[PDB]
Point group: D2
Chain length 276, copies 4
């Protein structure tokens, strides 16, 4: 005897967990990203312009910060996320700036990886599809095999029109697994000026890493966030497979070309594929 | 071990209970409100215009259907709700119509009854504040006295300018308690063309009704639960007076008509109009 | 992720909720039963001996206080309960006194009302089956008709031999519903010397009382919750007849005395004695 | 609106989770131990007799199987566990055999590691205290440091009278961690004739192993059980510390003397300490 079904709202009632002490701290986290690094912007703009990208799909746009840059830089952006809770902030921003012609043109919609094909509006499909900030790692492997990772990837891939780009990244889980730590301050896209401590939890199921759970401490309060530990060799194969190997594929480590065995260990691997 | 804290989202992940069978059926419920009845529109519009209301605050605006009407009729509307889940549909609509001047001027924001004074923007406060559709009954009495009902009301009241209206209703809980049924099809504002069954659950705590919970089945057969505080007429009226310090004129309608104690016709909803003096 | 499945124990680990604040206060409640009133003993012993009862089945025996009396008075008692948590105290007692011949002969076993026929050992079935202290009211009506009440009763009935008694009671739910209070200090079997406050919660589903839940505070101030099905007198009586196919004699006591409809004195408990014919 | 507080029972009502599909399968597990191995009995009896043990405390006795043997072999046994749910089976057995003088004399009681000193009845304290079958591993480290392991051990230690034995064991977590598997069929005390599959989950917190969770499949149904991963070097130190190093201490691997670096890898380490 819950008083309302899980997931139903009520006029003038806060949705189920809005008021919780973890939420009102999680919103500090979701919004401490207000400091794009110079090196990131220079790289992304550089790559999209080099390949002649005009219409861009930004998947898992979150508060839309990456999208907002693209809109400002002259691109034709549609931005999607599954989370209403975060999409709300992008939608807000668009609205304040609804008066600027670029922002009138900015398309923001709900979409889920698992049904991406039905969700997104376009015809032709995009010049580039970007999925940056390690968002793909959010997707759990509940099934057991990786049948959800395969389907999500093939849906994102399908968004890429012949000669177009998929630009997608993962935190260096190779390094994470071997040290057993996901330390703070390592975002290459946005730098935080927030002090944090992180507890790293690695879950190994039947001798295969299966989840990395981060317990953040940041006025002092706790939130939890969880990740699928994508290893470089494996993620690469997953990406190829989404295209049927009809793609060229290169690997960056922190925006610079990556060579197996190099001495510098990157915080993130960034995969750029062009559909052939 | 939860893999994420309750109430935290993840880029590219549905928020906690979005895909549950009760949710994707609740959205069917919450978008039934699509057939405003003729005499509702004619009464509301008539009252606002009788008292010269221009600036209107719509509290718990839900998908914003009542607000959308007001904007379409020329009013200066601001619309609030605590539920992001619902405010989503209103914001959507405004966006589609952002091209019509009236909709550019429509203000939509997050607010909670418990902090309404801080939350809403304005100076100095509305011609009329409308809270209709029985939303106030959504607010539970967790603390046990009715201390929360007192504060909410007092906050809504405070939005009302000198000379202004508070327009606020309740389903007829007197009738509900005495027959122990809150049956379907009774909405006087929007008529459903959806078939439903309702189970009605009345909770009495130490001899005072404390909660009415409704378990809907809707016709693909699916279920959801929604809960209410049972505001009786004599009580709610006192509560409303108290929100104004009695410095108000108050009258009671039953289904849009003047209501008289002991009349034979039993109204589905009581609707309270108060003017601040 | 739970670290162990719900309901599995671990060598050297307390079972799931043993150390919770409500448990270690519930045990204070469940061992209040330590002051049998004089007129209870005198009525029970009197009835059993009037009808020549030797072999007795005590159903929901809890800590076994009623059973311990019967054994001490010379009866052939078997005692059952579904709750391991409670059966623990009875088993303990038997063990301490395992040296007295009467206690060597006392049978104590696990049984569930839903399967009572399979569960209890015997051939051919008891002189009297006693289920007293309002335990039957513990059984919820989850399925909605009273199908479970029917089966339980029918199972208990089946334990009764030709010529035998079923002795079974209910707190007076008629009174409870009509005043909306189940107040403390009313036990006619055991008197507490413990101070308590009770909150009474009545759940009505589609116009039929479906549950009474009691939230106790006990005087170190601690809280626990316990729930009951509200058996009304007219109804429970029909249910009991039906368990025997009407092939039974039935009478109703109010607090150990013959009960007559419309009398002025309002009993705390109704106690039903039925003899199989 | 739970209808009754968590952990309260009701005359003629099954305690909270008794009826669950995991429980009625867990009882198959708790009772598939009806086949003591010959080698175990020969070792334990041998050791207790060698040191002249008469009064024995069996901690975490579970269904009492080890205790029942001791009672049958002539010892003065008191047997304790925290779990009513399992203690119930020992108590049962005693009762059926209450007629045999040895079983009249058998003391069975409730006790918790954390308060063992107050819980157990004795004066002098025991000739040997046995905690076998890997039960100590059941005790989680919720605190974070190992302050509960330290207190439990010092309580068990305190049960041992001058010149007496603590005999206590752990599954080989060294091996478990390094292979990432806790496979079935490896009990050296009791052999199962039950077919099982096990999923092994290792949880590493801040680079220190913290939990091993076993999901059993055994008519096919699932239960879960969890363990603290005690490593040999560390557990040894913990045991010494419980005595203040005023103890001699040897290590067996599967009942045979254990030598660091030997080629045979044991399933269990068994610690025998004598208080000096
Ligand atoms: Cl107007
Ligand atoms: Cl007798």
């Amino acid at each position: 005897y819950r008083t309302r079904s899980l997931g139903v709202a009520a006029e003038g009632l806060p949705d189920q967990y809005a008021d919780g002490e973890a939420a009102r701290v999680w919103q500090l986290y979701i919004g401490d990203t207000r400091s794009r690094t110079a090196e990131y912007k220079a790289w992304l703009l550089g790559l999209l312009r080099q390949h002649g990208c005009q219409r861009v799909l930004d998947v898992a746009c979150g508060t839309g910060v990456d999208s907002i840059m693209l809109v400002e830089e002259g691109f034709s952006v549609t931005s999607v996320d599954a989370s209403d809770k975060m999409l709300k902030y992008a939608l807000k921003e668009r609205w304040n700036r609804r008066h600027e012609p670029a922002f009138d043109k900015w398309v923001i919609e709900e979409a889920n990886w698992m049904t991406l094909d039905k969700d997104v509006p376009q015809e032709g499909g995009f010049d580039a599809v970007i999925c940056l900030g390690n968002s793909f790692a959010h997707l759990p492997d509940c099934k057991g095999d990786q049948s959800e990772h395969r389907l999500a990837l093939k849906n994102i891939a399908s968004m890429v029109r012949a000669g177009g780009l998929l630009v997608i990244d993962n935190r260096n889980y190779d390094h994470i697994l071997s040290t057993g730590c996901a330390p703070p301050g390592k975002n290459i896209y946005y730098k935080s000026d927030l002090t944090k401590d992180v507890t790293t939890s690695v879950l190994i199921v039947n001798n295969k890493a299966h989840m990395v759970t981060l317990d953040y401490t940041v006025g002092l309060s706790k939130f939890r966030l969880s990740y699928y530990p994508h290893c470089l060799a494996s993620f690469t194969e997953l990406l190829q497979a989404a295209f049927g190997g009809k793609c060229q594929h290169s690997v960056l480590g922190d925006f610079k070309p990556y060579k197996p065995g190099q001495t510098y260990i990157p915080c993130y691997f960034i995969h750029v594929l062009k559909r052939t």
